[PDB]
Design an enzyme around this catalytic site. Structure first.
Site, short mmCIF file in Angstrom:
data_model
loop_
_atom_site.label_atom_id
_atom_site.label_comp_id
_atom_site.label_asym_id
_atom_site.label_seq_id
_atom_site.Cartn_x
_atom_site.Cartn_y
_atom_site.Cartn_z
N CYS A 81 -0.17 4.18 2.45
CA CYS A 81 0.10 3.72 3.82
C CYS A 81 1.57 4.07 4.18
O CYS A 81 1.87 4.61 5.26
CB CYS A 81 -0.12 2.20 3.94
SG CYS A 81 -1.75 1.58 3.35
N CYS A 86 0.76 -1.25 0.00
CA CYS A 86 0.00 0.00 0.00
C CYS A 86 0.81 1.32 0.00
O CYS A 86 1.38 1.73 1.03
CB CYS A 86 -0.96 -0.02 1.19
SG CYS A 86 -1.87 1.50 1.35
#
Length: 112
Positions: A39, A36
Protein backbone atom coordinates in the site's frame (compact mmCIF):
# COMPACT_ATOMS: atom_id res chain seq x y z
CA UNK A 1 -1.74 14.31 -1.24
CA UNK A 2 -3.03 15.59 -4.64
CA UNK A 3 -6.69 16.10 -3.74
CA UNK A 4 -7.50 12.80 -1.96
CA UNK A 5 -10.25 12.84 0.67
CA UNK A 6 -9.50 10.92 3.87
CA UNK A 7 -12.57 9.12 5.24
CA UNK A 8 -12.68 9.17 9.06
CA UNK A 9 -16.13 7.77 9.72
CA UNK A 10 -19.09 5.88 8.29
CA UNK A 11 -20.97 9.22 8.22
CA UNK A 12 -18.29 10.81 6.05
CA UNK A 13 -18.31 7.61 3.93
CA UNK A 14 -22.12 7.97 3.32
CA UNK A 15 -21.81 11.71 2.64
CA UNK A 16 -19.07 11.15 0.10
CA UNK A 17 -20.98 8.38 -1.70
CA UNK A 18 -23.97 10.71 -1.94
CA UNK A 19 -21.76 13.50 -3.32
CA UNK A 20 -20.67 11.09 -6.07
CA UNK A 21 -24.34 10.34 -6.84
CA UNK A 22 -25.31 14.07 -6.76
CA UNK A 23 -22.40 15.29 -8.88
CA UNK A 24 -22.62 12.28 -11.23
CA UNK A 25 -18.90 11.63 -10.98
CA UNK A 26 -17.43 8.18 -10.32
CA UNK A 27 -15.55 7.64 -7.01
CA UNK A 28 -12.31 5.65 -6.69
CA UNK A 29 -11.54 4.47 -3.19
CA UNK A 30 -8.20 3.11 -1.87
CA UNK A 31 -8.53 0.79 1.14
CA UNK A 32 -5.17 0.87 2.86
CA UNK A 33 -3.49 0.18 6.21
CA UNK A 34 -0.45 1.67 7.94
CA UNK A 35 0.98 -1.86 8.29
CA UNK A 36 0.52 -2.61 4.62
CA UNK A 37 3.80 -2.74 2.65
CA UNK A 38 2.58 -2.66 -0.97
CA UNK A 39 0.00 0.00 0.00
CA UNK A 40 2.85 2.40 0.89
CA UNK A 41 4.50 1.57 -2.42
CA UNK A 42 1.40 2.45 -4.50
CA UNK A 43 0.18 5.40 -2.46
CA UNK A 44 2.20 7.95 -4.44
CA UNK A 45 0.67 6.87 -7.71
CA UNK A 46 -2.90 7.10 -6.32
CA UNK A 47 -2.15 10.67 -5.19
CA UNK A 48 -0.73 11.63 -8.57
CA UNK A 49 -3.73 10.09 -10.26
CA UNK A 50 -5.97 12.20 -8.10
CA UNK A 51 -4.32 15.34 -9.43
CA UNK A 52 -4.47 14.21 -13.03
CA UNK A 53 -8.17 13.52 -12.82
CA UNK A 54 -9.01 16.35 -10.44
CA UNK A 55 -12.53 17.43 -11.39
CA UNK A 56 -13.39 14.25 -13.34
CA UNK A 57 -13.20 11.59 -10.61
CA UNK A 58 -13.44 11.84 -6.78
CA UNK A 59 -10.74 10.02 -4.79
CA UNK A 60 -11.18 8.68 -1.27
CA UNK A 61 -8.85 6.92 1.11
CA UNK A 62 -9.93 4.54 3.82
CA UNK A 63 -7.53 3.29 6.53
CA UNK A 64 -9.23 0.02 7.38
CA UNK A 65 -8.03 -0.10 10.93
CA UNK A 66 -9.21 3.48 11.54
CA UNK A 67 -12.68 2.85 10.05
CA UNK A 68 -13.53 -0.81 10.67
CA UNK A 69 -17.25 -0.45 10.03
CA UNK A 70 -16.58 0.70 6.47
CA UNK A 71 -13.88 -1.88 5.80
CA UNK A 72 -16.16 -4.61 7.06
CA UNK A 73 -19.24 -3.62 5.07
CA UNK A 74 -17.03 -3.24 2.00
CA UNK A 75 -15.91 -6.89 2.39
CA UNK A 76 -12.17 -6.31 2.01
CA UNK A 77 -9.74 -9.20 2.59
CA UNK A 78 -6.45 -8.35 0.77
CA UNK A 79 -4.63 -5.06 0.54
CA UNK A 80 -4.53 -2.81 -1.17
CA UNK A 81 -8.05 -2.90 -2.59
CA UNK A 82 -9.54 -0.27 -4.80
CA UNK A 83 -13.26 0.16 -5.44
CA UNK A 84 -15.13 2.29 -7.95
CA UNK A 85 -18.55 3.59 -6.88
CA UNK A 86 -21.18 5.00 -9.25
CA UNK A 87 -24.66 6.20 -8.18
CA UNK A 88 -24.16 5.04 -4.64
CA UNK A 89 -23.12 1.43 -5.42
CA UNK A 90 -19.98 -0.55 -6.15
CA UNK A 91 -19.37 -0.84 -9.89
CA UNK A 92 -15.86 -2.18 -10.17
CA UNK A 93 -12.75 -3.16 -8.16
CA UNK A 94 -9.08 -4.08 -8.24
CA UNK A 95 -7.10 -5.98 -5.60
CA UNK A 96 -3.32 -5.75 -5.37
CA UNK A 97 -0.60 -3.15 -6.00
CA UNK A 98 -0.38 -3.33 -9.81
CA UNK A 99 0.42 0.15 -11.10
CA UNK A 100 -0.58 -0.56 -14.63
CA UNK A 101 -3.89 -1.96 -13.61
CA UNK A 102 -4.74 0.97 -11.25
CA UNK A 103 -4.13 3.44 -14.14
CA UNK A 104 -6.28 1.38 -16.52
CA UNK A 105 -9.12 1.29 -13.98
CA UNK A 106 -9.14 5.05 -13.37
CA UNK A 107 -8.81 5.84 -17.10
CA UNK A 108 -11.61 3.45 -17.87
CA UNK A 109 -14.06 5.06 -15.49
CA UNK A 110 -12.88 8.62 -15.99
CA UNK A 111 -13.51 8.41 -19.73
CA UNK A 112 -17.21 8.14 -18.83
Amino acid sequence: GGSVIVIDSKAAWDAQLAKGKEEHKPIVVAFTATWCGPCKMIAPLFETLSNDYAGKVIFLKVDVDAVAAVAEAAGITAMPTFHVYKDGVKADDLVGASQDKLKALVAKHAAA
